Amino acid sequence: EIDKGIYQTSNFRVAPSKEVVRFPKLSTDLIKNQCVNFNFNGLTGTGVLTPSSKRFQPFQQFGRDVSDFTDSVRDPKTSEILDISPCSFGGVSVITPGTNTSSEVAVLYQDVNCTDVPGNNVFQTQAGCLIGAEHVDTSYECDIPIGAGICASYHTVSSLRSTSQKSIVAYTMSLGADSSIAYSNNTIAIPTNFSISITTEVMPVSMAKTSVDCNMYICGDSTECAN
């Protein structure tokens, strides 16, 4: 049984499409704008291959990042400087109401664009591609945090009248009610009645006092062990 929430079930990775290799074996020269297993001059990396912008020094062949990653290359067989970037990789997370309520789920690809994703409607959000959530323009108080101000919930979407689809709806958060109090230069609001309100506040005080003997865990009563 699952309870309501986003749960981060696994990761995601986009596989390279075609292998390309060059030399100064044989050469399959260039595939562009796809995750490719490039092999330039004996260096093999899996990354999207794109044209390079900035002007290299004539001797300088490989462009380097601040963290020493290579972000550009020079073709050893043909001559062109190519920008190098990583292929997309995020972590899938399953949004689901409480399994008691329903077995409908939606998925969230936590960084990728909806072009990369391999479920009838998709929603491109700042968090990631949200598949299985019917976007609505109404606003409620947050139920399940996707992020960038949007939260998902289990509500009636009003497909035809209200077909009781109760599908997962992703809506931008409502901060709270809107109140109408006006500034006036000579008016004061004085209460005439009062209420006695009792509330409860819960505070943790202590946790369970645990003891773990090192020898029993590490060596498990072995005489040879512990030396």
């Binding site: 609001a189 004085i190 506040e201 505070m203 202590s206």
Partner: protein
């Protein structure tokens, strides 16, 4: 909040125990088995790997538990402060003991925690009136003391800021302190003299 600390404790202990049955590069995950299958000179090679693995798991457990304990301690300190300030007294501090204005707090025990029942006074059913900073009666201003000037429609009254008890204005309820000219929004009315 009480259930979550228990859940994190249980998950830490269960992960610790689960980490036991795991080769760390060793041929087996049971010390008994490696001893049986290997002579001590080549048994120590595997046993050292298992010791390193279990030591590292124990260190992770201890470290995380320490940080968690500090958080629990901080919560307890706040609970003690709350008990002292709300239960044994009345607290002027806002939203510290309840929501609204604090009247009493009662303690209740909970498994590894404390529950505070705050009792608060919430104003309600407001009535909106017209009002004046002060009154110029006979060439002198008359500021209120512990109240506000209000006008219900027939006369001006003075009342407390939180409950409407309308009362006639006298010299008892006001102090003069200056002339009528300076005050921005002076309003004309008579101050009733009880002595006269």
């Amino acid at each position: 909040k009480l259930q979550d600390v228990v859940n994190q404790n249980a998950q830490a202990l269960n992960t610790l125990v689960k980490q036991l049955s795991s080769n760390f590069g060793a041929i087996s995950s049971v010390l008994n088995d490696i001893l049986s299958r290997l002579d001590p000179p080549e048994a120590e090679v595997q046993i050292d790997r298992l010791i390193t693995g279990r030591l590292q798991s124990l260190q992770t457990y201890v470290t995380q538990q320490l940080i968690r304990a500090a958080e629990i301690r901080a919560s307890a300190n706040l609970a003690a402060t709350k008990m002292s300030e709300c239960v044994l007294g009345q607290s002027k501090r806002v939203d510290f003991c309840g929501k609204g204005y604090h009247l009493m707090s009662f303690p209740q025990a909970a498994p590894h925690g404390v529950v505070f029942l705050h009792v608060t006074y919430v104003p309600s059913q407001e009535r909106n009136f017209t009002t004046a900073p002060a009154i110029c009666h006979e060439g002198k201003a008359y500021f209120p003391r512990e109240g506000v000037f209000v006008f219900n429609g027939t006369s001006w009254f003075i009342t407390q800021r939180n409950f409407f008890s309308p009362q006639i204005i006298t010299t008892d309820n006001t102090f003069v302190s200056g002339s009528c000219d300076v005050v921005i929004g002076i309003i004309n009315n008579t101050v009733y003299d009880p002595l006269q």
